Scaffold this active site. Sequence first.
Site, short mmCIF file in Angstrom:
data_model
loop_
_atom_site.label_atom_id
_atom_site.label_comp_id
_atom_site.label_asym_id
_atom_site.label_seq_id
_atom_site.Cartn_x
_atom_site.Cartn_y
_atom_site.Cartn_z
N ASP A 141 -0.52 -0.15 -4.87
CA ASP A 141 -1.84 0.32 -5.28
C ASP A 141 -1.88 1.81 -5.76
OD1 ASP A 141 -1.41 1.25 -2.70
OD2 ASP A 141 -3.29 0.34 -1.90
N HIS A 142 -0.96 2.66 -5.27
CA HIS A 142 -0.91 4.14 -5.56
C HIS A 142 0.30 4.70 -4.83
CE1 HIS A 142 -2.19 4.60 -1.54
NE2 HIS A 142 -3.29 3.91 -1.79
N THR A 173 -7.17 3.38 -1.96
CA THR A 173 -6.83 2.01 -1.66
C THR A 173 -7.79 1.00 -2.22
OG1 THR A 173 -6.14 2.85 0.47
CG2 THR A 173 -6.13 0.44 0.16
N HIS A 175 1.13 8.55 5.44
CA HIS A 175 0.13 9.49 5.89
C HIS A 175 0.66 10.37 7.04
CE1 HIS A 175 -3.40 8.55 3.50
NE2 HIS A 175 -2.93 7.31 3.50
N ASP A 215 0.81 -1.20 0.00
CA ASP A 215 0.00 0.00 0.00
C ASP A 215 0.86 1.27 0.00
OD1 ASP A 215 -2.12 1.62 0.20
OD2 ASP A 215 -3.07 0.61 1.84
N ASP A 257 -21.36 10.29 -26.77
CA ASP A 257 -21.48 9.49 -25.55
C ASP A 257 -22.42 10.23 -24.60
OD1 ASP A 257 -21.14 7.33 -23.78
OD2 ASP A 257 -19.25 8.13 -22.89
N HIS A 264 -3.14 10.64 -0.71
CA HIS A 264 -3.24 10.23 -2.12
C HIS A 264 -4.71 10.24 -2.44
CE1 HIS A 264 -4.69 6.42 -0.44
NE2 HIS A 264 -3.74 6.65 0.46
O1 LIG Z 1 -7.92 -7.07 3.16
C1 LIG Z 1 -7.49 -6.15 2.46
C2 LIG Z 1 -7.14 -6.44 1.06
C3 LIG Z 1 -5.88 -6.91 0.84
N1 LIG Z 1 -5.46 -7.24 -0.38
C4 LIG Z 1 -6.33 -7.12 -1.39
O2 LIG Z 1 -5.97 -7.42 -2.66
C5 LIG Z 1 -4.62 -7.81 -2.91
C6 LIG Z 1 -4.44 -7.88 -4.39
F1 LIG Z 1 -5.54 -7.52 -5.12
F2 LIG Z 1 -3.41 -7.12 -4.77
F3 LIG Z 1 -4.14 -9.11 -4.79
C7 LIG Z 1 -7.62 -6.67 -1.30
C8 LIG Z 1 -8.45 -6.57 -2.54
C9 LIG Z 1 -9.53 -7.59 -2.76
C10 LIG Z 1 -9.90 -6.17 -2.49
C11 LIG Z 1 -8.05 -6.32 -0.03
N2 LIG Z 1 -7.31 -4.91 3.01
C12 LIG Z 1 -7.61 -4.56 4.39
C13 LIG Z 1 -6.96 -3.18 4.46
C14 LIG Z 1 -7.73 -2.13 5.25
N3 LIG Z 1 -7.33 -0.93 4.52
C15 LIG Z 1 -7.55 0.36 4.98
O3 LIG Z 1 -8.34 0.45 5.90
C16 LIG Z 1 -6.86 1.57 4.41
C17 LIG Z 1 -5.49 1.40 4.14
C18 LIG Z 1 -4.73 2.41 3.61
C19 LIG Z 1 -5.34 3.63 3.38
N4 LIG Z 1 -4.85 4.84 2.87
N5 LIG Z 1 -5.84 5.71 2.87
N6 LIG Z 1 -6.98 5.20 3.33
C20 LIG Z 1 -6.73 3.85 3.67
C21 LIG Z 1 -7.55 2.81 4.20
C22 LIG Z 1 -6.78 -1.33 3.24
C23 LIG Z 1 -7.54 -2.65 3.09
C24 LIG Z 1 -6.84 -3.74 2.29
CA LIG Z 2 -4.05 2.43 -0.33
CA LIG Z 3 -22.45 5.73 -24.74
ZN LIG Z 4 -3.44 5.66 2.36
#
Ligand SMILES: O=C(c1cnc(OCC(F)(F)F)c(C2CC2)c1)N1C[C@@H]2CN(C(=O)c3ccc4[nH]nnc4c3)C[C@H]2C1
Ligand SMILES: [Ca+2]
Ligand SMILES: [Ca+2]
Ligand SMILES: [Zn+2]
Length: 805
Positions: free
Chosen positions: A308-309, A159, A265, A121, A683, A420
């Site tokens: 992710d970003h 995220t 953060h 993340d 569109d 982000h």
């Molecule tokens: O359980 C997963 C998960 C973990 N891995 C995946 O996918 C992995 C993959 F896709 F790459 F393979 C998938 C996807 C299935 C939804 C889901 N979680 C639980 C973490 C809780 N969380 C946060 O509260 C949060 C975190 C950072 C932030 N920044 N700013 N605001 C924020 C809020 C991020 C959520 C990711």
């Molecule tokens: Ca994130």
């Molecule tokens: Ca269209």
């Molecule tokens: Zn974040």
Amino acid sequence: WTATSGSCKGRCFELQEVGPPDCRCDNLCKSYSSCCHDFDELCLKTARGWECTKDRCGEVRNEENACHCSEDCLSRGDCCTNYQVVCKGESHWVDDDCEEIKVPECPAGFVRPPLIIFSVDGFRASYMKKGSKVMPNIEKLRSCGTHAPYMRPVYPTKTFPNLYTLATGLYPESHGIVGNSMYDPVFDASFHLRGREKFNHRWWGGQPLWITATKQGVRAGTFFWSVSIPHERRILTILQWLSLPDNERPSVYAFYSEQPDFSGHKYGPFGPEMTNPLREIDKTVGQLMDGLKQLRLHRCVNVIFVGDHGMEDVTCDRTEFLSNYLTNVDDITLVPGTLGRIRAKSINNSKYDPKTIIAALTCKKPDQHFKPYMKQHLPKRLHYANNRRIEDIHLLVDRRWHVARKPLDVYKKCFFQGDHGFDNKVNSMQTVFVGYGPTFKYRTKVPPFENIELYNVMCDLLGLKPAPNNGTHGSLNHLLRTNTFRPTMPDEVSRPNYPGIMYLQSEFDLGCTCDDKVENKLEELNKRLHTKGSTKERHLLYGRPAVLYRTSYDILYHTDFESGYSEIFLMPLWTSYTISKQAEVSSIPEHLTNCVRPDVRVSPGFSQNCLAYKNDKQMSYGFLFPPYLSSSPEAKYDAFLVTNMVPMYPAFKRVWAYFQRVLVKKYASERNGVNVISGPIFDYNYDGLRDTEDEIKQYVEGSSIPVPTHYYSIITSCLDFTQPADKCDGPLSVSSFILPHRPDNDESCNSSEDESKWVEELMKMHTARVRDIEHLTGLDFYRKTSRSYSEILTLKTYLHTYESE
Ligand SMILES: O=C(c1cnc(OCC(F)(F)F)c(C2CC2)c1)N1C[C@@H]2CN(C(=O)c3ccc4[nH]nnc4c3)C[C@H]2C1
Ligand SMILES: [Ca+2]
Ligand SMILES: [Ca+2]
Ligand SMILES: [Zn+2]
Ligand SMILES: *[C@@H]1O[C@H](CO)[C@@H](O[C@@H]2O[C@H](CO)[C@@H](O[C@@H]3O[C@H](CO[C@H]4O[C@H](CO)[C@@H](O)[C@H](O[C@H]5O[C@H](CO)[C@@H](O)[C@H](O)[C@@H]5O[C@H]5O[C@H](CO)[C@@H](O)[C@H](O)[C@@H]5O)[C@@H]4O)[C@@H](O)[C@H](O[C@H]4O[C@H](CO)[C@@H](O)[C@H](O)[C@@H]4O[C@H]4O[C@H](CO)[C@@H](O)[C@H](O)[C@@H]4O)[C@@H]3O)[C@H](O)[C@H]2NC(C)=O)[C@H](O)[C@H]1NC(C)=O
Ligand SMILES: [K+]
Ligand code: NA
């Protein structure tokens, strides 16, 4: 209710989830308050920590330890990841030279190389270079495998939208997860980071990789982890799962790190406090790889290291407050922060006006740090409109800023120094991609690409057929040693007519006029050859685009350009022309200012008419091939044919004229010639897909001339710019855009000035991929090149971003 009195003995991190109120021992149980009474005791052991030390070697198995250094642990699959290093004189994976992995080297019983997705993340793309001294494992993965200099997240660069895009290959508008908080009016419900609603399946559209795999009989390790299971225990669990018997072992695994986002953060992206979480992520990667090497799987598993970003510098004093702009600030709900979304506080209020709210946020302050948009007017490259969960009013927030409703919201919720969520073309939001394993290439750099493309590649890596998605399958074949998918060009559905001269001038009653009755026996052969397509190889460089839907259309040849003219929409679907480095710009002669000429190849009944434009006080007209770039005074007459005409707001003509008069020529000098294809886009339901005739909401008054919502252009040239566009022997280079066709220039705060101070900035904002234009037009471009089709697919997914380095 969970009757939480059963036992986890023998079921720690079970793969199938059991049906409540029977008690759960899976990796998600904590999050449902549903783990058996003894879960922590049995499944979350921590005794003695995570590393073997010399004195633990050949110990007597003690079941209470978090991991084992005893003689039987390899067989039991549960050694500490450093067991061989400490107790068998082995080296760490990171200390080995890399050796090309030409074929998978797997234990007997493995039917396919396993895939491990290691997602991090908030891992900004420049960490790869900037933290390289403290991430030796990650640097080994990167230099030995296949890597991009960065990977583009989707918008918003939050995220949950990005993780779910990774899992599905879908835009947030299609998968449903359009933000970290959402309100769905059809459900009537809100989705938040806090709480239980986010767990209901109704939010999550599309088909994620684990479900694709399961339906096709590939078994999947669980992707979600509960937030309180530590990193070392996730790694050990993945390694344990990898020791299961062949019929029980998953083929795909997912690991998630909350770092470095969590610290980012608090301390900002390059805060000194950021070195330590990078070291820790590197150490976890080291644990995984040492674990694989122990199991002899390190030249068998495909590992994806993916973010992710990124993360940008953002502090509380860089907050713009809507209360400084609006008066009825209490009749609105804002979803705040690095993007804004506005809706009405109350749906029983018909005194709420989106238009007044927008006007009240437009160019109100000279240094304003956001821009309001109706969602259908957002840049089409963001693909952020076609979901009931996305509010009609959107605020695109400047990098480094925040938007909030009132000051009380910011101090009765400075905390944070990083955030982000911004526009996905912003450098600081870019993230990472590395692939390492037998199926990825060895020591290979690939160009930056979008995260929507990875689902197809993961499906390829696992021998799965992907669910329908927004990737362009084949566009990442250059990442892979083998397992490539062999894409084929879509079949043309409609073939064109090639009309000759069929109508006399006097059959036309279009109310058009032109000063063009002036008069040679030699150049009468020429004009005729030009109308038969004698110059066509010069203006149509890559074949005609293929029309991929059922329709009626004509190919029109001219000295300076070729077009595909739609009898249904009464205008070209596409106009193609090449402008060489040497070409001259001239002006429209004075006697030819209002000239429009009937085209004797096309019937009155399928032509636009000048009367309609006269009667329509809002609508004017423009031309697709620009008269300024005519090759001779005689060829200029062709540009005034009624078949080259398209409807345009006067406000839009300012943008278009400047593009045609100044910018095409600038690009042709810079790129050593360009080929240009331009055309309209319709569109009206903002779904990013071509509208059918019955979907058009707007016509030029008192006529059946449909009004485009956008105009596009694709500008192609040779990647080796020492070669002219019309004689290019290798790879192509492209940039494109989709300009919104709007009756005002409210979007550009400086539009009162010369076009040279604002027009190109607007075009840059509306940069696009050729693939975006294909979806919006039902056309397929680049049908006849000397390039391989995989290469053309990469070129069609390219986006020119206009950021620095
Ligand atoms: O359980 C997963 C998960 C973990 N891995 C995946 O996918 C992995 C993959 F896709 F790459 F393979 C998938 C996807 C299935 C939804 C889901 N979680 C639980 C973490 C809780 N969380 C946060 O509260 C949060 C975190 C950072 C932030 N920044 N700013 N605001 C924020 C809020 C991020 C959520 C990711
Ligand atoms: Ca994130
Ligand atoms: Ca269209
Ligand atoms: Zn974040
Ligand atoms: C990015 O890639 C994606 C994936 O390929 C592309 O999206 C697809 O576009 C298709 C065309 O628009 C679309 O096909 C329609 O599907 C309808 C059935 O939909 C359900 O089933 C699928 C398959 O399992 C499922 O994926 C869908 O999931 C959506 O909805 C659920 C719950 O509602 C959500 O959880 C989920 O997030 C997802 O939402 C998204 O899609 C819907 C629309 O489908 C949007 O409204 C959302 O905002 C969101 O973006 C569904 O559960 C099917 O019924 C349609 O058929 C009508 O139209 C055809 C035209 O050929 C006609 O022949 C039929 O007879 C029928 O007409 C009738 O219905 C009309 C409309 O109601 C009505 O006017 C008529 O009078 C008739 O009664 C249609 O085939 C497909 O669903 C999506 N897939 C996904 C995952 O979104 C996307 O286009 C790509 N983006 C770009 C820019 O290229
Ligand atoms: K007019
Ligand atoms: Na303006």
